[PDB]
């Protein structure tokens, strides 16, 4: 069931095409995250939906009703700002009741709704305090309660938890996901953080320079990238070069990678002489001894640096050709059999069917 | 201690003449140089003087009216500049800056020639217009400085919550800008009560204020009745400032 | 809403400030008349008369008298603003307010009070003799020194406030970085603080120099007939002799100086930002 | 011994920020002061730098007292959080300010400034104001300005906090290499634990103006001293236990959460004493269903599986009512991974790999 349908959205600001052309659909009852580098244009889409900006050309729907030109006062869309946009003189109670008062709500219902909204975010006893008497985590909850009390069809969040510390951010990442399920309305989130998007979202859209690169579930993004930018942006990847020699069967293809031959799993059709990119992640590579290898063929290289990062050990490995390859693994210092040698000939291997093959 | 002593010297510099004219009010000597006893005669003679009291009333009326109109126009202009973002804002700021940093003699003679090229008699209206003209920039600067210390996203937040513009200017901006409005009113009142140069150019015999009345008496000699007027004006001007803070609170 | 406020404020300024100024500059080029004031005859006699020695010595005297008053305000005003910036935030507004309380009494009465305070047989001469600092009475009335004392009195508050605003907007880490790198208090002032607060100095100078060249009641009451300011010259031509074109020619010199100081302000701001 | 602090106290607005602090900073090392927000690290840094005066105690630098010496006469330079960066000077003059203000002959100013700019890879941006540069450039200018006076100790105050995530990872290694190149001691104040683990040679943990632990990055993560340091550096699982008998000099039998197991204890204990057993989330294994005479020790249900990209966190619930929060890698293309949700499960560890606290 579609809720917002953007068709042919364009916008130009000061002789700059921020949004060339965008087609997007937002369903009902999900958590959606717009993620990308700085300056890709997520805030423009958010403001166009909210109504604080007007589109140069295109069409916008909400529940099969055209709101392209309806002003940003009659739409059923509410927004949470980055700076929390709080009125200083008003109290918490009046901050929450602002939207209800300017909707001509009957006076009898105002107090129970406001108290319920404050209870939803655990702030029922700070009703009569004012801002500047509250911490950041409290002001954020006041903003969310002010946005949610009008029963909107859609809630927009713009980098909401950016200014906070680590553990408090981790805890509110979970309360927001619980609140979305408790209410039952669509959330649209804009963030620059990768792990934050991967944790709390049910559908991720990656944006670069005003265009959509990939849309899918978090697993479909971290595990099956579509191009090189998406693979390198979320997570961290190793780029290998390949040339196709021959095909054995429908799903296994022989090719050389950096001067060594091994089998790779390719599903789409290829022809001999074609160049490919084989992508592997740090946690999927294994460094093993070659003196008693007697297992299979693999890459040869030396270990230059061993970095201790707490829970994980990151190793920088130099191949014979000269490309940098980095391997990650857990640190078990109480294991008697733990490799620690440096500047030695050791092999690099990976388990079959764990690669991501992308054509060029 | 040396830092505190320097600050006292500057305050003692400005306040000593006021103390002298307050004390010499009760002096019996007409010239005021020496001290020759305590008399109350000057206050009684002032009470029976008509032209002096009329001039004082005219000055106070001009001050109040000019302060009110300047406060209104400047507050509206400051809200206009702060609320919107447009291409012409630096130009308006520059014009206001140039108006503020201009000689008073040029501004007086320009208004004289303008009012003589339009056949407007010199009196109430010319004086009121001149005072408003040279009081506006300070009000604009005060209110703009006060408003720029707050986030501008609150207006967008009010829009998203379903508030029209007039509601936004009747519920958000005004309570945050009232203490600046009171200060603008007080500053304009002081500036209109202090000026001597413009008034001596753009006025006429029909409307007489304290500056030219005292200037006329200078050629003959200033009686200590003037000192008796200055001390009362201090108390009356004091309570007006006290009232303004309470109303704004 | 948006258009009404902008048109009214722009219409008010163009009608009352800018257009009349173009009338003054255009009046300096026409020809005098007894009953018609200005007559439409383009002449350059007005500007060339300013080069006569009689009317050129008066202009030179005013510049020296105003320049020293500006310097005296800067020397006594920068330390006052600096010390007010090292005080608790609650007491600062009260101290600033106590600078405009004297302004409620009119300016023409406060100079009259100061004249009595500085007279030969008045106070500040009896007290000094009683203390014994001086031996014979000090006579400074009707001298160039008296005018400069009076001008500093009236216009000192106008210089303090621009300087205090610039000082309070300074960044504390910038002052701490210099101290770390080996700067004495003197070298921090010459190389960091003064360049960062230069627009505040130029703003204060404009508000104290130009108004000090038009105060005619200081010269009349404290200076005499030998020590005159430009405002006395303009006043006579506009209200007693009724030679209006000459008054416009004299007032141009004040306008020309305004442009030079304004240009410094724009150039000082661009470099700083 | 470079800087020795003895009995330093400081009070600000009546509230104590440093009760009593003893510390020794050696020569040629990287030291990081790590702790929660508002614990008095910045006060220590400013006290060493000379921008604040102590209320009691002594500060020494190469066995000469510098308690009352002003900041201009100390051989310590500081990099500020906001990159002070005087706006009216070029980069060349910014770097040469300190040399110019110590009465240095004019022949040596240009080569020294050029070399300092070269060490931070800014030799070509010599004539540009500090508003045409980006964050990294400004940071490198600040570092070059600090290190051109040849100081005996460089102080850094949350230097790389405002940058992005990849530039941070690059400049951490860059600074770690620069320290070895120069040969002087660095003191760094940080709020991020990963930076302290990956960049430091000695970490000092502070809380409420007091020292909690001091040692190698390995020691803090692997051998915490009290319950605060664990759970601040990473995630911890605190299990209660009761000692029964001492099997030998190394292993002691105990009752953990109502079940018996053998644990390693390295100090004297007596039956009845209460013990704390701490285990990292990644050291715990949720193995197959309970097999007789194969796996024993704990019983619990999964109750959740959270996906976080590289790793997968499962918060299991025991029989008593406690969470355990197991962590592990996510291998999807491996055809034996378990996706079970709410049945009987087993919790084990490796008979060691545990930290026992008294
Ligand atoms: Mg481990
Ligand atoms: Mg896979
Ligand atoms: Mg995986
Ligand atoms: Mg261990």
Numbering used by the authors:
A (entry chain A): 15 to 374
B (entry chain C): 5 to 253
C (entry chain B): 7 to 279
D (entry chain D): 16 to 373
Sentences from the paper on this structure:
The PotD-PotABC protein complex in Escherichia coli, belonging to the adenosine triphosphate–binding cassette transporter family, is a spermidine-preferential uptake system. In general, ATP binding, hydrolysis, and phosphate release trigger conformational changes in the transporter, leading to the uptake of extracellular polyamines. Here, we report structural details of the polyamine uptake system PotD-PotABC in various states.
